[PDB]
Amino acid sequence: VRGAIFNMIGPYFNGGRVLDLFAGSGGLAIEAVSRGMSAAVLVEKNRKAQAIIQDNIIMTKAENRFTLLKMEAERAIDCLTGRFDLVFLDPPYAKETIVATIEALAAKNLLSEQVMVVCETDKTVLLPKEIATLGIWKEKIYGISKVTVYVNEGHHHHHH
Amino acid sequence: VRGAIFNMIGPYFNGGRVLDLFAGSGGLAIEAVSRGMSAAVLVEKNRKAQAIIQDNIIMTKAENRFTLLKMEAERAIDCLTGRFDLVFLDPPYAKETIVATIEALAAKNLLSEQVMVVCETDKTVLLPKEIATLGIWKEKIYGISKVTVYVNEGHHHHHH
Numbered sequence: 303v304r305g306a307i308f309n310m311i312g313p314y315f316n317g318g319r320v321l322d323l324f325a326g327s328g329g330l331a332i333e334a335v336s337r338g339m340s341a342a343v344l345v346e347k348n349r350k351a352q353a354i355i356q357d358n359i360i361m362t363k364a365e366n367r368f369t370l371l372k373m374e375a376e377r378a379i380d381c382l383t384g385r386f387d388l389v390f391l392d393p394p395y396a397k398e399t400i401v402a403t404i405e406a407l408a409a410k411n412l413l414s415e416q417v418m419v420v421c422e423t424d425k426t427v428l429l430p431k432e433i434a435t436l437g438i439w440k441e442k443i444y445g446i447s448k449v450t451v452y453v454n455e456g457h458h459h460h461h462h
Numbered sequence: 463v464r465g466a467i468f469n470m471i472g473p474y475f476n477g478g479r480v481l482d483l484f485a486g487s488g489g490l491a492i493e494a495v496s497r498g499m500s501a502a503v504l505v506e507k508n509r510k511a512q513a514i515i516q517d518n519i520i521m522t523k524a525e526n527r528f529t530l531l532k533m534e535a536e537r538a539i540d541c542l543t544g545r546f547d548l549v550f551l552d553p554p555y556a557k558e559t560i561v562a563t564i565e566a567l568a569a570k571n572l573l574s575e576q577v578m579v580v581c582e583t584d585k586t587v588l589l590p591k592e593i594a595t596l597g598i599w600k601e602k603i604y605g606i607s608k609v610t611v612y613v614n615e616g617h618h619h620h621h622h
């Protein structure tokens with residue numbers, strides 16, 4: 303569904319910083335940078351996922367644009383600084399706390415003025431229309447998952 | 463002071479990852495990227511230093527190349543994953559912390575084969591010739607400071 307997600311929020315980007323809080327294989331972050339983002343911070347504590355991410359980043363030929371952090375998402379939010387323009391939140395079902403996480407990101411001033419938060423959850427997960435200062439821009443349900451995209455009030459339209 | 467330091471280890475670089483522990487104002491990491499390093503991870507626990515770093519990062523017009531972590535160096539090392547090509551160390555309890563930090567970095571396999579670990583300390587601080595698998599390559603004293611650079615046994619000779 304990589305192409306599906308990017309057809310929603312992209313397909314191409316104008317640079318910026320990406321935060322992938324539950325990076326997994328690194329797919330989301332890597333493709334985002336590929337499609338136009340400048341750099342990406344990937345957070346994934348899963349030992350097995352690490353090796354895969356490492357290899358995927360090296361295969362991009364622009365590996366230095368990726369920073370992998372082996373830590374819990376909550377911990378990462380309390381240690382990262384600066385601001386992110388695109389945030390990917392695809393937590394495993396049992397650890398999913400989209401609302402709390404976005405509120406934390408906003409409270410820690412980790413979101414850029416023009417920010418987009420892409421959430422991937424089970425199809426059955428209901429999310430509020432507004433979280434912090436963000437609002438749902440798009441929501442698509444395909445297969446057993448649902449992708450919900452939050453953006454800041456006044457987020458600029460995407461250029462085609 | 464930076465001109466002297468970089469004439470020792472540079473003066474230019476063709477890409478790579480920088481790690482600036484006990485970053486302070488982040489001056490070394492920023493200059494290293496300006497000279498050719500690809501990206502930098504800076505770790506600084508002090509709140510005032512963090513503010514300064516964030517501001518300096520903006521003045522580079524290439525802020526997307528920096529990742530600032532607000533955490534203890536020890537904690538940071540346990541969360542880092544990529545191999546680093548250039549490491550800057552200027553910590554409190556210099557001699558003690560430099561040895562412990564290099565030992566930790568080496569144990570976590572966070573140093574590239576051709577890594578340069580650059581230590582800036584008071585002129586009187588005496589550092590050991592060897593730490594873990596590293597050894598002193600260069601050491602220069604000027605003004606009221608001393609720069610010591612550690613490298614791995616297989617470090618390649620540098621150009622002039």
Ligand SMILES: OC[C@H]1O[C@H](O)[C@H](O)[C@@H](O)[C@@H]1O
Nearest residue numbers: 315316317318387416417418
């Ligand atoms: O927040 C989303 C926006 O982030 C950055 O500004 C990107 O350059 C832009 O392409 C993207 O639409």
